[PDB]
From a paper:
Getah virus (GETV) is a mosquito-borne arbovirus, and belongs to the Semliki Forest group of the Alphavirus genus within the Togaviridae family.
To gain structural insight into GETV, we determined the structure of the mature GETV-V1 virion at 2.8 Å resolution by cryo-EM, the highest resolution for an alphavirus to date. Each asymmetric unit (ASU) consists of four E1–E2–capsid heterotrimers, with three heterotrimers forming one unabridged Q-trimer connected to one heterotrimers from the I-trimer. The atomic model of the E1–E2–capsid heterotrimers includes the full-length sequences of E1 and E2, as well as residues 111–268 of the capsid protein. Four densities for glycans were modeled and fitted associated with N141 and N270 of E1, and N200 and N262 of E2. The five highly or absolutely conserved C-terminal S-acylation sites strongly anchored the E1 and E2 TM helixes into the inner leaflet of the lipid bilayer of the viral envelope membrane. Two cholesterols were modeled and fitted into the densities adjacent to the helixes, while one cholesterol was fitted in one density in the cavity.
Residue numbers in the entry:
A (entry chain A): 391 to 438
B (entry chain B): 368 to 419
C (entry chain C): 111 to 268
C-alpha cells in the first residue's frame, strides 16, 4: 500500500502552477489596464 | 472539467475586456461623428482607430 | 421669411400612427432626428438607412443619400450675443441659453432648427423648461469637434 497521504495538488510554485500563474497574471494585467483606461475616460467625461 | 472551466474563464475574460474596451472607444468617438461638419483630430484618430 | 423656406426643404416630418411626433433635419450631410421621437420618417430614402443610437446626447443621425445634400440646410458655429430666428417666433441668446416667450411651444414640435440672420443652422430644439414669461430651451449645440447638450433644470421634453 501507499505510504503517503495521497496528495496530488502541485506546489504553488510548481511548473504547472507557474504557467497557470503566468497566464493569470498576464490576463489580470490586461484587465486592470482596461479598467484603468475606462475609469480615466469616465472621470474625464464627468469632468467635462 | 478543470480545463473546460479554465478555457471558459479565459474566453469570458477576453470577451469582457474586448467589449468594455470597445465601449471606451465608442464613448470617446461618438460626439465627433454627431457634429454635422467636424474632423476627428489626428491624435485621437490614431489613438482609437477612427473609422475614416 | 427666408428661414421658413429654408426650413421647408430641411424638415422631413416624423409621423407615428398618423400623428406628426417630431421632425428631422438635413444639416451638413446628416439627419438631425432626436432620440426620444418614436416613429417613421415619411420619405422612404431616409427610412431605409441605418441610424446610430445616442441617449446621453439624445440624437439620431444617418448619412443622407447623394440626392439629399443639395436639399439640405447650411450649418455654422457663430453664437454671437444677440437674436436668432425660429419657426414659431424668435430665440433670445444670452449667457449660453436659448429662451422663448411662453405659449409658443406645445408638446411635440421637436426637431425644428434654429437659424441665424442669413440662414445658417445653429441649433436643434429638443425641449424646454418653463421660466416665467421667458421659457428656456433644451438644445443640441456644437463647436469645431464637440457637440454639447445643454438641458436647463426642471425641463420637460416637448
Ligand atoms: C483559470 C483557472 C481556474 C479555473 C478552473 C479551475 C478548476 C475548477 C473547475 C473544475 C472542477 C473540477 C476540478 C476541481 C479542481 C480543484 C482542485 C481540488 O480538488 O483541490 C483539492 C483541495 O483544494 C485545494 O487544495 C485548493 C482549492 C482549489 C485549487 C486551486 C487551483 C486548482 C487548479 C486550477 C488551475 C488550473 C485549472 C486548469 C488549467 C488548464 C489550462 C487550460 C486538492 O486536494 P487533493 O488533490 O488531495 O484532493 C483529492 C483527493 N484525492 C487525491 C485522494 C482524490
Ligand atoms: C472549448 C473551451 C471552452 C474548453 C476547451 C476544452 C477542450 C478543447 C479540451 C480540454 C481538455 C482536453 C482533453 C485533455 C486530454 C486529452 C487526452 C488525449 O489522449 C486525447 C485528447 C483529450 C481528451 C483532450 C481533448 C480536448 C479537451 C477536452
Ligand atoms: C482556451 C481554450 C479554447 C482551451 C484551449 C486548450 C488548448 C490550449 C489545449 C488544452 C488541451 C490540449 C491538448 C491535450 C493533449 C494533447 C495530445 C497530444 O498528443 C498532442 C497535443 C494535445 C492535442 C493538446 C493540444 C492543446 C490543447 C487542446
Ligand atoms: C500600472 C501603470 C499605471 C500607469 C497608467 C498610465 C495611463 C495611460 C496613459 C494614457 C491614458 C489615456 C487614456 C484616456 C483616453 C484619452 C482621451 C480622452 O480622455 O478623451
Ligand atoms: C468602422 C468600424 C470600426 C471598427 C473596426 C476598426 C477598429 C477596431 C480596432 C482594430 C482591431 C483591434 C484588435 C482587436 C481589439 C483588441 C482588444 C483586446 O484583445 O484587448
Ligand atoms: C498586460 C500588458 C501590460 C498592460 C498594459 C496594456 C496596454 C494596452 C494599450 C492601452 C489601450 C489604448 C489606449 C486608448 C484606448 C481608448 O481609450 O480607446
Ligand atoms: C464592482 C462594481 C462596482 C461596485 C463597487 C462600487 C464602489 C466604488 C465606487 C464607484 C466609483 C464612484 C466614484 C465616482 C466616479 C464615477 O462616477 O464614475
Ligand atoms: C501575449 C503576448 C502579447 C499579446 C497581447 C497583446 C495585447 C494587444 C493590445 C490590445 C489593446 C487594444 C488594441 C486597440 C487600441 C487602438 O489602437 O485603439
Amino acid at each position: 500500500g501507499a505510504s503517503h497521504n495521497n496528495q496530488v495538488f502541485p506546489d504553488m510554485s510548481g511548473t504547472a502552477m507557474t504557467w497557470v500563474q503566468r497566464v493569470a497574471g498576464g490576463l489580470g494585467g490586461l484587465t486592470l489596464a482596461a479598467v484603468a483606461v475606462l475609469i480615466l475616460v469616465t472621470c474625464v467625461t464627468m469632468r467635462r | 472539467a478543470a480545463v473546460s472551466a479554465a478555457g471558459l474563464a479565459v474566453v469570458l475574460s477576453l470577451l469582457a475586456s474586448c467589449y468594455m474596451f470597445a465601449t471606451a472607444r465608442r464613448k470617446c468617438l461618438t460626439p465627433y461623428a454627431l457634429t454635422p461638419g467636424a474632423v476627428v483630430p489626428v491624435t485621437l484618430g490614431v489613438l482609437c482607430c477612427a473609422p475614416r | 421669411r427666408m428661414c421658413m423656406k429654408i426650413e421647408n426643404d430641411c424638415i422631413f416630418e416624423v409621423k407615428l400612427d398618423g400623428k406628426v411626433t417630431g421632425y428631422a433635419c438635413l444639416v451638413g450631410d446628416k439627419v438631425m432626428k432626436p432620440a426620444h421621437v418614436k416613429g417613421v420618417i415619411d420619405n422612404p430614402d431616409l427610412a431605409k438607412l441605418t441610424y446610430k443610437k445616442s441617449s446621453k446626447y439624445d440624437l439620431e443621425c444617418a448619412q443622407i443619400p447623394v440626392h439629399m445634400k443639395s436639399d439640405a440646410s447650411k450649418y455654422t458655429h457663430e453664437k454671437p450675443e444677440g437674436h436668432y430666428n425660429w419657426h414659431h417666433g424668435a430665440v433670445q441668446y444670452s449667457g449660453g441659453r436659448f429662451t422663448i416667450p411662453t405659449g409658443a411651444g406645445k408638446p411635440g414640435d421637436s426637431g425644428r432648427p434654429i437659424f441665424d440672420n442669413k440662414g445658417r443652422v445653429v441649433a436643434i430644439v429638443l425641449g424646454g423648461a418653463n421660466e416665467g414669461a421667458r421659457t428656456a430651451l433644451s438644445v443640441v449645440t456644437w463647436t469645431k469637434d464637440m457637440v454639447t447638450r445643454y438641458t436647463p433644470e426642471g425641463t420637460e421634453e416637448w
